[PDB]
Each structure stands twice: as C-alpha cells, then as structure tokens.
Design an enzyme around this catalytic site. Structure first.
Site, PDB file in Angstrom:
ATOM      1  N   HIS B  43      34.530  44.160  38.636  1.00  0.00           N
ATOM      2  CA  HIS B  43      35.198  43.655  39.817  1.00  0.00           C
ATOM      3  C   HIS B  43      36.594  44.310  40.339  1.00  0.00           C
ATOM      4  CE1 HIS B  43      37.345  40.571  37.828  1.00  0.00           C
ATOM      5  NE2 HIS B  43      38.009  40.559  38.885  1.00  0.00           N
ATOM      6  N   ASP B  99      30.171  42.104  34.161  1.00  0.00           N
ATOM      7  CA  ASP B  99      31.202  42.366  34.919  1.00  0.00           C
ATOM      8  C   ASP B  99      32.082  43.204  33.790  1.00  0.00           C
ATOM      9  OD1 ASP B  99      33.485  42.591  36.942  1.00  0.00           O
ATOM     10  OD2 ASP B  99      34.311  41.047  36.103  1.00  0.00           O
ATOM     11  N   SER B 197      42.515  40.138  35.009  1.00  0.00           N
ATOM     12  CA  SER B 197      41.292  40.404  35.324  1.00  0.00           C
ATOM     13  C   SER B 197      41.297  41.908  34.826  1.00  0.00           C
ATOM     14  CB  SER B 197      40.578  40.553  36.520  1.00  0.00           C
ATOM     15  OG  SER B 197      40.292  39.239  36.783  1.00  0.00           O
TER      16      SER B 197
END
Lengths: 30, 245
Positions: B43, B99, B197
């Site tokens: 993502h 992810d 992230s």
C-alpha cells in the site's frame, strides 16, 4: 547477505545500542 | 513513530526511505535485504482507496539516511527503482492482506557502516521468536503525535496474541499478518505512525546475535494495536521473485 543482521557500528565493535537489552529482556519476561 | 526516540546513527543500516519526487517528501519506509533488493509494504505504492498508484519513476530510494530531510553526503546513497513487484494476492479492499512489495535497484549499492542488509527469517527463527510477549523493534521517520521528527525514530513493542489481535478490531486479521503493541493497561506507549509503513519490524536473535525482519509495517496502531506483514509467511514469494531476477 552472508553478513546480514550484524551492525558495522554495533555488533562489529561489541557495542549494544541504547535499548536493545529491552528486547532481550522480553524473551525472559522482565 | 509514537513514544519512541531518536535512533543512534547506524543503529539500523537496513532502513530505507521511499522519497517521492513531487511533492518532494517522504512516502514510506523500507529495508535493505541485499545489494539490489528493497522490501516495503504494498500500500505504500498502490492503494486505490486513496487513488494511489506510484510508478518506478514517481520516486526513488534514499539508503543509509539518518536525518529526515537533510541530504547526507558520504553517508546516504540514492538508488533508482528498476522494477516494482507487488504481491499478486495483495488485497486492499478488505484488510491489506499480503501488504508487501519488492523493489529492485538499477544498480547494486555498496555497504558501509551506515548501509547494511538485514537477514530474513526462517521457520526456526520465526517459529521461535514470533511469540506474543516477545518485543520486536520498529523504526522510521513517520510522524510523532510539531509532529515531524528530526531524525529516524525507534521503539520496541510486544507481539500481541492472535486471539487478542482479532477482538481488537472488526478487520479479519489473516495469517499473513500479526499485530504488535501494548495493551492500554501497560502504561508505556509506543507504536508505528503514518509514514512508518513499509518499515522494518525486527528482532535480535539470541541464538546468533543477528537481526531479523519479522514484519513490515502495514497498519500503524496510532499517533488498538499495529498490524504488520508476516515476513516468513511470504518468504516463499520473496525468493520466487529473487530467483526470477
């Protein structure tokens, strides 16, 4: 890749980063 | 990172920064697993809900960095993304399952006291270190709560039991992921914030003193528990891509 995971300025000089011990203690419990 | 602290120079030589070209700014984090391979969340590059679709040219990777913004001569090296590999079964529409993404460099980067790859897990290591209670480490230049850290931040946090991970949300946590963080009654706080992230979640193995990447920052708890990609769970895929190139 064959020397991965070992830090040039820490493991390679027998030095422990500021708070890695905390991690070690986790394995124990406290 | 929330409730963390300024990391020590070279304390995480495998940290990689995903810098966007315009607006020029930090997009995400990543790790160096070889001289040509970088690992990050899926993502961080492609996320339709937010109209996000970054091509290899939309950015590049700054390796061996410490400061969040300042360029760092003779310290950080900049690479050019040759190819991006998002996991085929990566679904965003439900919970960022799988992810994860691989980024290959156009040219192999040399290692230094600031740039050094981290080792990937294995069943033994994973099966032995991936246990609720055990603390892992996360790093990044993500926000804090100004809310912009000067240099890379660092924080250690416990793995939470899959059962507990579940109840803590209506998101169907898959086996390709695991949650880490403190329970509200622990007092001490600390977690991965937005911007962290794609960042490495690591552990120092007592059986060989080396650092291993157990996860990738998928869904920071705050700025509840944070969700990370189960690296070993997807090691098979990683190699498949590596052997492929």
């Amino acid at each position: 890749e064959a020397d991965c995971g070992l830090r040039p300025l820490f493991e390679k000089k027998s030095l422990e980063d500021k708070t890695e011990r905390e991690l070690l203690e986790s394995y124990i419990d406290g | 990172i929330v409730e963390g602290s300024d990391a020590e120079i070279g304390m995480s030589p495998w940290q990689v920064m995903l810098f966007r070209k315009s607006p020029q700014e930090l997009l995400c984090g990543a790790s160096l697993i070889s001289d040509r391979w970088v690992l990050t969340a899926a993502h961080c590059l492609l996320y339709p809900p937010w109209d996000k679709n970054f091509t290899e040219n939309d950015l590049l990777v700054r390796i061996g960095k410490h400061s969040r913004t300042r360029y760092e001569r003779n310290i950080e090296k900049i690479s050019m993304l040759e190819k991006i590999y998002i996991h085929p079964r990566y679904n965003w529409r439900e919970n960022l399952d799988r992810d994860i993404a691989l980024m290959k460099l156009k040219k192999p980067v040399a290692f230094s006291d600031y740039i050094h790859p981290v080792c990937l897990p294995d069943r033994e290591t994973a099966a032995s270190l991936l246990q609720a209670g055990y603390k892992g480490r996360v790093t990044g230049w993500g926000n804090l709560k100004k809310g912009q850290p000067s240099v890379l931040q660092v924080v250690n946090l416990p793995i939470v039991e899959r059962p507990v991970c579940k109840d803590s949300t209506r998101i169907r946590i898959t086996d390709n992921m695991f949650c880490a963080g403190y329970k509200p009654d622990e007092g001490k706080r600390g977690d991965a914030c937005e911007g962290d992230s794609g960042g490495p979640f690591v552990m120092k193995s007592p059986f060989n003193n080396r650092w291993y990447q157990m996860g990738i920052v998928s869904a920071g708890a705050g700025c509840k528990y944070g969700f990370y990609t189960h690296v070993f769970r997807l090691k098979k895929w990683i190699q498949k891509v590596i052997d492929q190139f």
